[PDB]
Amino acid sequence: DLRAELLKALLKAVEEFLKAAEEAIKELLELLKKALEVLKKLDPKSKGVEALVKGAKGAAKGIEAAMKIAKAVLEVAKIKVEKAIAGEVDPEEALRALRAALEIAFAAFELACEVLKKTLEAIKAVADDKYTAAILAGDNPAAQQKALAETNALCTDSLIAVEGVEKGLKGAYLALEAIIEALEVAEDEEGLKIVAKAIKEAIKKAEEAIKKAEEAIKLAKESVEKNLEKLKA
Amino acid sequence: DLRAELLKALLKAVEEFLKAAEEAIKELLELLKKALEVLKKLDPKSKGVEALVKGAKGAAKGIEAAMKIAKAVLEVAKIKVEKAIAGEVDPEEALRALRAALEIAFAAFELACEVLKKTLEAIKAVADDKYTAAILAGDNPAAQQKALAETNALCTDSLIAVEGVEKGLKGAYLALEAIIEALEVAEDEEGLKIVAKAIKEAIKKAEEAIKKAEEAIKLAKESVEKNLEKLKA
Amino acid sequence: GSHMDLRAELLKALLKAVEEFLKAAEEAIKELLELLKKALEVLKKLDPKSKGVEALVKGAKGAAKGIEAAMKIAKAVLEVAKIKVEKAIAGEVDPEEALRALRAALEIAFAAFELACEVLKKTLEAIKAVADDKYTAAILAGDNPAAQQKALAETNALCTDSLIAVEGVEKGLKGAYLALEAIIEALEVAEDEEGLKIVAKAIKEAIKKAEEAIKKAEEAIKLAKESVEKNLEKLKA
Amino acid sequence: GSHMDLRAELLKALLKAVEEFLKAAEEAIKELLELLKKALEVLKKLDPKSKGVEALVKGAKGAAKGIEAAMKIAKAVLEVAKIKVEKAIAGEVDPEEALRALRAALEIAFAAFELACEVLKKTLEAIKAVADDKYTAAILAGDNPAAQQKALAETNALCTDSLIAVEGVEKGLKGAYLALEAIIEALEVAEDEEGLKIVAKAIKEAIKKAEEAIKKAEEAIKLAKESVEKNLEKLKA
């Protein structure tokens, strides 16, 4: 009865994780397009920048495909949980199914953060190299140093925002992963009662971490979106 | 009995590791709170920083939840060790439990160091963008460069302190992780006698590393706390 | 027939996607190792009497040998993967052995690819760091600070552009590797008919999107060749 | 018959290659920990009243202890690996049990090695960052900015060359580790006679390329010792 109770609370918590993960992925990929536009306008004749754009588009395709799989695996996990509660299938198959949906989602999420991180850092590096060339050329060094300082200030604020999103979900992914690891060690009734108290508290805090992560995702949207418009201008 | 002898010292070593890991997590998360305060004060109208603050609190929740699991798994590990010493259960079940408790804690510990590192780097990056804006604005560039230089000195030494704590326990985690793998390969009596000498010396060096890590934990609180006050000041 | 046919259909398209991935991975490694050769020459010319620079050259050549050796393995495993997939379609072998074989060929190659991008990045970052230390030493010595800062700014612009190009190549295949790894993970969880009907739609779309990612990566690889090769010539001059 | 001879032949050459890796990795670890001692002293001399620096020193001493423990385990497992290989040749034990032992000894050794490279790299980066904070504070204070800016450039030049040297060591063995890891993965997939015949060609070539990487790595280890040691004494003076 305790095992069936834990599997339900874990399954519900994992469902909440995929929702937040999907919201993040949709918004991060939206920011990436606008970021890629700013980068092209900043350096339109660079084959290196063009390679990054093609590479970023390819990575974006893989992220979308990977989450579609994660949603389907969650559905297979739902059935396996019911059957594990009904005693038809070994509960370990349900844990591996829940683990699969969890790991696939976070994997796609972490790649989205990395592509956006590298893109914002690319804009910063390209801008630093463009203005510095004008400063040393005497093309109004006073105005160039100001735009350089402003641009770096805008990219830094966006990089800090994206890093907050990763740390938000990484904490939730860490808690849920520890819960699944406890269930794999607690195979008998004796073990399950030892971890039951810790696991129940972990599932609640994991959902709290998702809440703070969802809040962080919203602020990251406003932060990066506004900063990308000032850069475009 | 020789296998039971190693399993006893190994269980003790993992218990000491979990003790140091908890103190580290307790102190690192405490420094994070003050670090988040300094970051907000540096740029109070930045939504990017706000996203990180929410994200950092969310990550902190996951670290506490993940460590609660590590405590429970250690208790389950203790019973499986007793049964392995008494011959009721295969020692492999005890090793799988010890590895889980060990890996879960270090995962939460390594994440705590990462969140704090990112926060200190944010304080450094935000200050660099604030002072540079004042230097270029003519608001006493001599004095601003002095505050800028001091701030970078304060953030840099704090990053060195956190890095010492992470490397301390990572060394201990490496030794214990190698011991568990050796016991899993040496299943027969012949194999166990070959690794016994290497394992016993490893247990001593691993505990010495945990002690050296605790010392680093002590210095890190005093160092970072003082440095964070000067930045706030 | 109603369900063993859907399994055979997915395993074939998956094998095709892995085949395209393995081809792109080989092309990437071939050119990245070529750019590394040109980069090591520029690095030696930048600091020819440094034992630190020489140590990296020795280390970089050793890593290149491991990348070439690792990819020869990845192609052979693909052949073993082909046999196990066909036998799984014919019901001769459990489908997990075919999935586990595909993972080996996939993971081993991408590992060699990941190292090629990393070694090239470290070399390009070394060229930038060595040049920064050479020009700054000349600027502080009064050896025409205006011209040195111009070369310093140009050099940093050229090294940065090459690092951005390499980063685009890695992210291109990483997206494809992400999709295919998720596809295999779904097939390993969906062993029965009921689960397989749920993931079939997502898997079919994923294999197409994965093939698009491989194409977008190949384009990035070609653009990276022209950019980095040309930039390395300007640095040598 | 002939397939068991091919398997026994590959397992022997693999064991030889893995044995060379652990020895070369051990020599590197011995030298890296020796350079780490000198590096911790240079950092201490640069900032003797910083508890942050002291915390890193204590942490580095602990990490150094863990690396030695991990390497002692890796040699013992290598001995167990040799016996399991002999038993697999005689057909007494499943070859998969021997592969997990070889992989274990391989993974345990490289883990300690990669940590050693990180600790030294982090220590060298700390010396560079601490020096930047010492000279810049003096430059802004008017304490002879001409001499301070030169010392700042000289220190960064010495730290950068050492970081390039250490990076050559990491890439050297990681390339060898990549080849050996790919070989072990191929043997676990090629269980039947047909599969073993496919990987024989790739594995035999890989073992030669893997040993070539070890040779180029050993050269890098020798050059890295002289480079980093020489740079560390100039800073001490």
Side-chain angles (χ1 to χ4, degrees), chain C residues 23-224:
Chain C
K23 289 180 283 186
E26 185 193 1
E27 183 73 293
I29 285 175
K30 169 199 169 76
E31 265 72 8
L32 293 172
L33 288 186
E34 192 49 57
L35 297 173
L36 179 61
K37 298 169 90 64
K38 309 179 186 302
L40 291 182
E41 301 316 308
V42 180
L43 187 55
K44 185 188 175 183
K45 297 183 68 272
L46 209 51
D47 200 354
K49 300 179 249 303
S50 170
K51 282 165 193 181
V53 169
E54 199 190 327
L56 181 64
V57 173
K58 299 304 186 172
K61 293 168 164 297
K65 294 301 179 65
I67 297 166
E68 291 160 4
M71 186 69 155
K72 295 176 167 62
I73 300 288
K75 299 198 258 177
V77 178
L78 176 67
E79 309 307 317
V80 185
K82 290 183 195 176
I83 304 178
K84 289 191 178 182
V85 165
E86 182 180 3
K87 296 172 157 177
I89 295 161
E92 304 169 48
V93 184
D94 194 288
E96 273 43 51
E97 287 192 34
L99 293 175
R100 196 182 323 113
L102 288 172
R103 293 178 68 188
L106 180 72
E107 292 182 345
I108 290 177
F110 186 67
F113 165 76
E114 268 187 88
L115 182 58
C117 292
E118 189 179 355
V119 176
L120 188 54
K121 282 201 251 70
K122 291 302 175 300
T123 304
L124 298 175
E125 289 175 351
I127 301 179
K128 186 166 169 188
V130 168
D132 294 2
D133 293 355
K134 176 173 74 64
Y135 294 121
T136 301
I139 297 160
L140 298 183
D143 313 321
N144 195 346
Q148 304 294 333
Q149 286 166 1
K150 179 182 282 291
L152 179 57
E154 292 167 349
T155 298
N156 298 4
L158 295 183
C159 292
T160 301
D161 185 59
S162 305
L163 292 169
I164 296 168
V166 179
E167 195 60 36
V169 176
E170 189 276 344
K171 288 311 171 274
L173 278 189
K174 189 158 179 187
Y177 176 80
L178 177 69
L180 296 180
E181 194 65 35
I183 295 167
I184 302 184
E185 195 57 55
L187 289 180
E188 287 173 353
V189 177
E191 297 167 350
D192 55 319
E193 2 166 285
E194 186 180 7
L196 270 166
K197 293 171 161 11
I198 305 169
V199 301
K201 182 158 184 295
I203 286 185
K204 287 180 173 170
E205 301 178 27
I207 298 177
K208 234 57 187 65
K209 300 183 92 295
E211 293 178 359
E212 297 173 23
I214 298 170
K215 297 167 190 186
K216 295 305 278 193
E218 293 277 41
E219 305 171 17
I221 298 166
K222 182 54 184 176
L223 293 176

Side-chain angles (χ1 to χ4, degrees), chain A:
Chain A
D1 299 331
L2 180 64
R3 186 160 221 159
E5 172 185 15
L6 297 183
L7 283 180
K8 285 174 173 177
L10 180 58
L11 173 68
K12 176 176 188 180
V14 175
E15 291 175 358
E16 194 169 359
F17 186 88
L18 274 66
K19 290 180 191 172
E22 185 193 2
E23 183 172 352
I25 285 175
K26 292 171 171 173
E27 299 294 13
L28 293 171
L29 287 186
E30 193 50 57
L31 299 173
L32 178 61
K33 296 170 173 185
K34 308 179 185 181
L36 291 181
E37 300 173 0
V38 180
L39 187 54
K40 270 184 187 176
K41 297 183 187 187
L42 208 52
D43 200 354
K45 302 178 189 179
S46 169
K47 281 166 193 181
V49 169
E50 291 173 33
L52 181 64
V53 173
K54 298 305 185 173
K57 294 167 164 177
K61 294 173 174 179
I63 297 165
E64 291 160 4
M67 187 70 154
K68 295 175 167 188
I69 301 289
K71 301 196 184 176
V73 178
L74 178 68
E75 308 307 317
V76 185
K78 290 182 195 176
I79 303 179
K80 290 190 178 182
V81 165
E82 181 181 3
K83 296 172 157 177
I85 295 162
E88 303 171 49
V89 185
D90 193 318
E92 275 183 354
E93 288 192 34
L95 292 176
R96 196 180 321 175
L98 288 173
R99 179 170 287 175
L102 180 72
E103 292 182 345
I104 290 177
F106 185 69
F109 165 75
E110 217 177 1
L111 179 58
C113 292
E114 292 306 320
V115 177
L116 189 54
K117 179 179 254 181
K118 291 302 175 164
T119 304
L120 298 174
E121 289 173 351
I123 300 179
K124 186 166 169 188
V126 168
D128 193 8
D129 294 355
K130 176 173 162 183
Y131 293 121
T132 301
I135 297 160
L136 299 183
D139 187 15
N140 195 346
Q144 305 294 333
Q145 287 166 1
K146 181 180 181 180
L148 178 56
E150 179 181 2
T151 299
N152 298 4
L154 295 183
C155 292
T156 301
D157 185 59
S158 305
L159 291 169
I160 296 168
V162 179
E163 195 60 35
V165 177
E166 185 180 16
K167 292 314 169 217
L169 278 189
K170 190 157 179 187
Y173 175 80
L174 177 68
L176 296 180
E177 194 65 35
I179 295 167
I180 302 184
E181 195 56 55
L183 291 180
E184 187 181 357
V185 177
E187 298 166 350
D188 53 11
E189 175 175 336
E190 186 181 6
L192 270 167
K193 293 172 161 173
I194 305 169
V195 300
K197 182 158 184 176
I199 286 185
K200 287 181 71 174
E201 300 177 0
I203 298 177
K204 289 149 135 179
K205 297 186 171 187
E207 293 178 359
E208 297 173 24
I210 298 171
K211 297 167 191 186
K212 292 305 184 55
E214 293 163 352
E215 304 171 17
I217 297 166
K218 182 201 68 168
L219 294 177
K221 197 184 178 177
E222 311 164 26
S223 178
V224 179
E225 187 60 43
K226 186 177 183 181
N227 298 338
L228 283 178
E229 296 172 0
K230 306 170 172 174
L231 291 175
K232 180 174 179 174

